[PDB]
Assembly symmetry: C2
Homo-oligomer: 86 residues x 2
């Protein structure tokens, strides 16, 4: 599994791959890896809504991997924090 | 990555996890792993439509992981072949 130190080390596609890994662990028999992926996701995005970005997408936004990416990108830009790698 | 010998060794959820792995490789920089997952998917499902089950879902069916699972389950049952493990 890929786990990078911060949002800026990920390209959008690589971040989408972390989100697919999380999608895969949602149907895992156990939660061991899922909790690790979810803890990591929260630590690195630093988004106020945490895992809600995944389970409770806003009604005005695309409930999809790229949709989460967009959400993060915008929040970080509005706050003057480094975004995704190019 | 999990790769089992046949459809009957997979539970529906484990098969859904193979499908998520394939979803992840679609955004991979390279196709090396993707072609392996896709070759495997075709060999074990033995479904006439091959990878079209993924890229070109029928209009009358749910374009989702469980949707593919249902499709496979039905085709195998109509042909008297062993299905998923319980």
């Amino acid at each position: 599994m890929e786990l990078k130190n911060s949002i800026s080390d990920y390209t959008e596609a690589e971040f989408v791959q972390l989100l697919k890994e999380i999608e895969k662990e949602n149907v895992a028999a156990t939660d061991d890896v899922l909790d690790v992926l979810l803890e990591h996701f929260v630590k690195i995005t630093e988004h106020p809504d945490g895992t809600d970005l995944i389970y409770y997408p806003s009604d005005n936004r695309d409930d999809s991997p790229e949709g989460i990416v967009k959400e993060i990108k915008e929040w970080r830009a509005a706050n003057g924090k480094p975004g995704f790698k190019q």
